Amino acid sequence: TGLEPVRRRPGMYTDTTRPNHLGQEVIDNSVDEALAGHAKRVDVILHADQSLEVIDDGRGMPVDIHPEEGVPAVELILCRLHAGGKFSNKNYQFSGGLVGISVVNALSKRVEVNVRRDGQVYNIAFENGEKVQDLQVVGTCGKRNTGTSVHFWPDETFFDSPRFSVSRLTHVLKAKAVLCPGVEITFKDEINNTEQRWCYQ
Ligand SMILES: Nc1nc(-n2ccnc2)c2nc(-c3cccnc3)sc2n1
Ligand SMILES: [Mg+2]
Numbered sequence: 001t002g003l004e005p006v007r008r009r010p011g012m013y014t015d016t017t018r019p020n021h022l023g024q025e026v027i028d029n030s031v032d033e034a035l036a037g038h039a040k041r042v043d044v045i046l047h048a049d050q051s052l053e054v055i056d057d058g059r060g061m062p063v064d065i066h067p068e069e070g071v072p073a074v075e076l077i078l079c080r081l082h083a084g085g086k087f088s089n090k091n092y093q094f095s096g097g098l099v100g101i102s103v104v105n106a107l108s109k110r111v112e113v114n115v116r117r118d119g120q121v122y123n124i125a126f127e128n129g130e131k132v133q134d135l136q137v138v139g140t141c142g143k144r145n146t147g148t149s150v151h152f153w154p155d156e157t158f159f160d161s162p163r164f165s166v167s168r169l170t171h172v173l174k175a176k177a178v179l180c181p182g183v184e185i186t187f188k189d190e191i192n193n194t195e196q197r198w199c200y201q
Pocket of ligand 2: 171175
């Protein structure tokens with residue numbers, strides 16, 4: 001797959017110290033929904049197995065079939081590597097700017113995406129960068145209840161430590177609530193057994 005280079009050279013796509021930047025890529029997407037005026041709340045969850053889950057009540061990642069590839073948008077998004085999200089020379093390094101949940105995919109033993117759209121609950125799954133589960137309807141919900149959950153398990157062999165840095169995570173989420181006044185951002189640490197909420201009028 002086109003995600004192959006990311007797994008050969010993870011350091012050229014992410015910070016391989018710890019999986020935090022993976023987390024920040026998913027959060028950025030949910031906060032983009034808030035910025036356009038579609039999500040009001042972003043819930044983040046550090047699970048006890050050191051996986052991260054990021055839920056927003058936005059429109060839902062798009063699930064329409066692109067005709068030329070005959071696959072749902074959400075899959076294109078998760079599988080397509082974007083160029084120029086991170087770059088380097090021996091004097092200068094940049095990242096990321098206006099990147100990709102696809103690097104999260106490439107560097108995860110599992111990813112699960114759930115999308116609430118039009119009263120349907122859609123599900124797609126990935127393992128080691130490869131699709132293990134086709135987009136499918138696994139439940140129903142209210143027509144008003146829309147948005148996206150991304151749940152991912154970082155592959156520890158790509159990082160110096162598989163552990164999320166709690167203080168780096170929490171500052172990011174605080175920073176995002178400041179950037180988007182009125183959005184509610186929550187963090188639930190199933191490890192340290194804490195609950196946190198930020199909202200700025
Ligand atoms: N969390 C999230 N992330 C999205 N995304 C887009 C690209 N990478 C992540 C996203 N896209 C949405 C969308 C995109 C186009 C049309 N309608 C909705 S809602 C959404 N919600
Ligand atoms: Mg700050």
